[model samples]
Target: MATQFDENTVITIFGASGDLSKKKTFPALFGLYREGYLNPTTKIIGYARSKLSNEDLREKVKPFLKKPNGAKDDAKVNEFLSMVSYHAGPYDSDEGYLELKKIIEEFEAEKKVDEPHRLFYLALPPSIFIDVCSKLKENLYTESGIQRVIVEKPFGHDLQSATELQEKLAPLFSEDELFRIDHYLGKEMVKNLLLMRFGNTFLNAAWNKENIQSVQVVFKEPFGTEGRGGYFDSIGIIRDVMQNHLLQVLTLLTMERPVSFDPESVRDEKVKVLKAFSPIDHDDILIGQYGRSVDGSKPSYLDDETVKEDSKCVTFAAIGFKIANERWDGVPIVMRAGKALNEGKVEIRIQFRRVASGMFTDIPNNELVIRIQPNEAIYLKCNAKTPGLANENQTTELDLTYSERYKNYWIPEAYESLIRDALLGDHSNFVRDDELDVSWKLFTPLLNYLEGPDGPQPKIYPYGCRSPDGLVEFLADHGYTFSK
Candidate 1:
């Protein structure tokens, strides 16, 4: 799967005029083209109801074409834009689909005998995935060559919903035919979590319950609903964040060794963790809502334009997990996430057993830390004596970084890896038909409790301070604590 690619194909993109296209799809594809990761004969076709000429679509996609913040040169940017084109079609119709089919056929012929044919980006909302899938089945799905479909996250809101959605669409595409994408899973830092754990002997050894104190995964962002309140309300932060992204990360961290790097082996370990989840101790979960700033400057969730003043939707949640497996038994994996926080960060801090109760003259606990987004680095904490000043020892880090080591590398987008797998008929990153059901079964009960009578009214915490009370303390009470 890590090999180079050579192909001749046209990429067909739906929802080319949508936000995702402008932000991620166009830029990622262009980035691939610029770096020569794409088929030499590749051409991209954009689609939307609003008709835009080629020059206009090119202009529309220009904002995303800026040199990546740390990169130099715009030559790669200009060259990638030349391959783009557009088409207009009603997203949900038979006649429109037929027209789209004819367009693709003619495009292939004009480009010379189709060396290969494949369908690429799909940014249309899932609300109409059924319609889109059906239309593709009728026209775009070509059996002779791979017809890959790359999709974004929140594959389904919950277990039952996801199962039903996949059940219905199972007929439209083969299991390996689809690409399920999550941006967090795409980050360089996250991919390293695997290598750090597997590549380093110290990490894998201390990862067990014996030397590990606690594992806390936190993601903080500054933006509120961003006018996504309507959809966000239906699928709270738990579903929006935890179910797909957070859970997947935890499963990987706690899962058993895989037989191989094949997608099945990788996912097999994760599903084991999900399936082993038992009755969750109520004390293990913390649900919270954001409050108006203590200074009354920023608005609370209630003040958001679309959310109701009394909405019980959770803007913040911290879940505590304990697996029954031998390797992770009693090891608590804490997942916490919130929007509108003091800092924007994603880091996994593994607190190790410190010096086995004052052994070795008070060596500090170790930690393997990786900040997954907006920042990229690998760091590990170790105990070392202070140099020359005193005999006292302190916790210091051994740091290695990717950005500093590599030159002219455009960290390929997770979409690139996921889409390439879809292109090659790989299901490793794609969610299984049953993963959703198990995931929903794991969290939905707590969700219902949080909404039902007898549920605790959400404890509201101000935006700029620490996490709501009871959550951090609860972690401390469970033998996970900080130094004085």
Candidate 2:
């Protein structure tokens, strides 16, 4: 499926004057350039409504560009920036788009290539997506070469809006030409899930309800949205993290092995898993909002000036899912995420069924833990005989921590990995439109129940606590046995 790398290309970034462009977009571009994956002849243009000159945009993004060898790589950074230029443009009108088209054509002519490709990275909000997308296609779409558009989340507020958004854009761009970015898919460990589960016979043998009891995907943030409460209030934790990132991880973990390594083959299994999920029941959920810390040192969520004083927004959520398929039936897939917690981390924990009673009595259950961040690691917790004369079981681990195991290798950032995929026209790591629809369909009912006027009120826990009070009980109720 068009897997060839397009070397002769022009890359344009919308919302180039925003923070996302500065922090992620430009830095990722610089990364590709430094690694020589991005062709030296490729031209980069930054587009925005803001009045930024070429040098102004360069200076804005320069500080955030990471150096591979500290200051020694300054010359390479300069070389990358030299290829970047800026163009001021309105999102809705034809005037700016016409000018943008001329610039792209000029670059194409200068290169004198038979087929010139164009990659558009939209770093703006969803409200302006229609305007930008329609304008770009109307003015700058190239039939002589490949063209791809990369759009970021939040795709929509809920199911209805998401479907409507898809409907409007369906005619402007075909599915093959569109790339929906979910940065979680590009994560090193998340990407490794395919090989880890399907590549190893030992792991695949026990990767189902028969051998596993409960699977949990967790996300924790140590601090609440300090200054971004205005935006956080409307979206809440469910939309921000649980729906897209954690769900993507769950599908990859639970889906059947694909027929091949092709992009559509991989994503087809994910969509199937999503279709098997039961709508989240109200009784199977626990919700919480952060209050003042025990020592009164930190602020509660409502204490923020940007949030509504009487807001009922949930800063924490733990929902249990049951897949109706044979492989995952009777197994609980729990997703828990929160802000203002005791620590910051993301991980997946798979707990296996207890051993036969005759062999081990009251021993801890076996577990496989995959840490996604803060020093990536994969370790299995199992029991062994104590070294002493007494015959007793001792719990230990088999660890494969990234930092310790791969000492000299460099792990690329999520954005860097994804941008490289777009350049190579690889859709393996991106989300499909149908997959997005199924995910939103699974969550929309719960979202409606939560946002309803008669919805359940969220319990208030201390800001720095591990989680809300019922977390332990919630796990226990779902047939999960905790390891010491």
Candidate 3:
């Protein structure tokens, strides 16, 4: 059963002064409050080491709080601010948690609720996750009501590290109490995957190796790390995006339909599909580092002051995976992600096999494209006869563009959607513990080899280009036919 909004609740954001909190966490909370999801008596507390007063914290987050009704919503924003308070405290010690607990209990007492739920949102870095979690469990955990924690990503550097982190966290919180976020899972199009596949007979009937030739899950960024090269240099493109975001998309696209939309049932199907993935073949991979653009306007990745002088870090990568299951065997699934590309977009393209011995020979292969962002669209490419000519054919799209289709609807931001789900105790969009293990398992071996001493030198591609020169050939080799 879905958990409803609790009127007597305390939501403590651990790293309230940080970037993630200022930009995403507080904005999402404000959004929920504005949308009437957060009840009147619910309290929001900000906890950080910085000695910020409630007004200071409010001022810090004010610019980021988007008004649903525009300038007219200022009154609503003021009301939202009234519900929030700030507490300055260190993460590792007992004093902070004790102080925080008192504030929480006071709120509950004022509300006169017998059982008041508590939620901890960690907007801090991974290094202090254990510390913050431990502190919260020890001092602030509520026995009278439910408690939950929302953890942000970079779960770990790899499988072993991730497992160790989980081991440490397991004793403090159960799997159900923890919400592991992969924001991509909360995306509108990504959430639409299940419905587009299982809800449509035409899509599901042909969604296997027998009809599909190649599937491409592509992520592109038109800009580099900008000035955050120090952080990007360490994590690189794969861990930053592909391993978590694109991988989640892959599971949703390929996983069998769940018996019901229950979180566990849906997650179980995703895990089963992930378990069937063959290890990514090194030979089938293409990696690239961006150099100066052809026009000499944009700087190369290595030109960043924060980046290493001779960094072999991969800015772009395209790799293929084969699922060893009956539904997807022999089908090429290519996942590609890059920084400083020609454009910014994330999309999935499923190219169907060619027409079998028909008069429509040499026609463009039918393709289903799901645009995940920027425009948010789904379009099917099909061959149609030319308007003027007789037997000629041209590629045309049957499109479902969000802007054009859903004119009056207000689509919530990914963070907003996930935060609301956490409030409701919904786990369907959040990553499960076993799902994390299997994802890391699939990518860790490849990560180890690439980060090893004898790793291959990445091909240098010009900034602002589509990809490395070899990308077209790489996709072609994987049975992807580029339409003329």
Candidate 4:
């Protein structure tokens, strides 16, 4: 641990009555409480515009919370609920904040703790982020204990808007005090990615362009937006998954080893690799919108009642990025994300070049595949002789499947890990201001093109298929040799 969590602390979640709070925030808080990670004396408060009793709030969050084992722990649940209370407040008003301030004061007084740390979690909409942030600084800020604000995404529509948001927020909170959440970075597999790359001597030796042909960071969702096209249509799949989630994976996969595991040292390397990113070539891109399923069972993207009939929003995209640095100059990094695919999955596939064409007739390309979800795994595909006295080579995997190998251990949800990091003030996994700027810089231009007057039209793909028609050609042109 980089730092110890203070016993005297308060975690106040904004928008407590909403879906985000009910679904993610409160459940993650309960997870911490159940797992004995939350401080014994820490206070949990819920603030929202909707009026709800403490009991009402408890019931709303109950569906998402889990038991320590398969069965319920009523004592633990009651104690956790006892720590939670609610506040009804208008985001932009002072009276609400003034009352909230008093509640925090009373809690500290009751605990006999004068200097209590505060963590404000913003689970509200982006429209009110600035409003809540501005008001919190004016009324809720304390000089006695540490203060931290955790803000979620939609940092902005693009580079300019994102920068504007940063400017507005910069005056209100210090850089060190803001913890931006990109939950994928906190995932068990992503955390394990760092150790796999740096801890193993053999891996680092071959993790470069000289031996590697191409890399792919893939995100696929089996279900489409269903009826949520109002939000999905506006953001599309690129920003929904690739810009933040998969990009974090790419950085970890390519970044140089940090001098140490300290936060800045790790972030410094990530920023450096991102800085070396080559602009995405327009010709190397593939975009798609899902059509009706092959059996006419599923609706197309445009068929959704909420989506506009003429919307050009891409539900799926595959973009090629190249790191122009020494370690990976020409190797293409294909980032593909989509909705309504064959299955839900997120994985990284790094394909090593083929063996020299001298002895073996068909040698499989060695691949390091890290499956990040739906049963997490780290497997290396290597060619070996068939078992029955045959010289023929076959693809066999050297595997470490998490479900089978680590049955007893509990892997905390991404939010739980991230919240713990915030409590400890360890920012190794969170996105920094400069890092966000560079990321939007890398993708904003393409976004503009896609949204322009003569923007490219997305190709149509069946809802239940693997991907768009051109996916194979797109990857093959970039030198990706698929095993299956």
For model 4, residues 25-48, the per-residue Cα lDDT tens digits are 999988888888897788888999
Instruction: Give the residue spans of candidate 3 off by over 4 A.
Output: 385-392
User: What does each candidate score in C-alpha RMSD?
Assistant: 2.8, 1.5, 1.5, 1.8
How much lDDT does candidate 1 score? 0.73
Q: Supply candidate 1's per-residue lDDT for 109.
A: 73
lDDT of 2 by residue, 3-31 (tens): 45555588999999999998999999998
What are the runs in model 2 whose C-alpha is more than 4 Å off? Answer: 387-390, 405-407
Candidate 3 lDDT, 224-252, residue by residue in tens: 87688877877889998999999999999
Pull out the clashing pairs in model 2.
none
Flag clash pairs in model 3.
none
The residue pairs in collision within model 1 are 263-428
TM-score of 2: 0.97
Alpha-carbon local distance difference test for all models? 0.73, 0.89, 0.89, 0.88
TM of each candidate vs. truth: 0.91, 0.97, 0.97, 0.96
Model 3, position 80, has a per-residue lDDT of 91
Per-residue alpha-carbon lDDT of candidate 1 for residues 1-484, written as tens digits (9 for 90 to 100): 5222245577878889898888777877776666667665677888888978888888899887646643554766766777788888887787767887787778677765444567567797777777788888887777655677776775676556777888877899766667667666666667667777877886787778888888877878765674666567767778878877888777667777787978778777778778988756665777777778887887777777888767788878888887787777777778888876678787777788765555574666677777777557778887787899797877778886667754556677777655555555667666665665787888877776776666666778786656777876877865576764
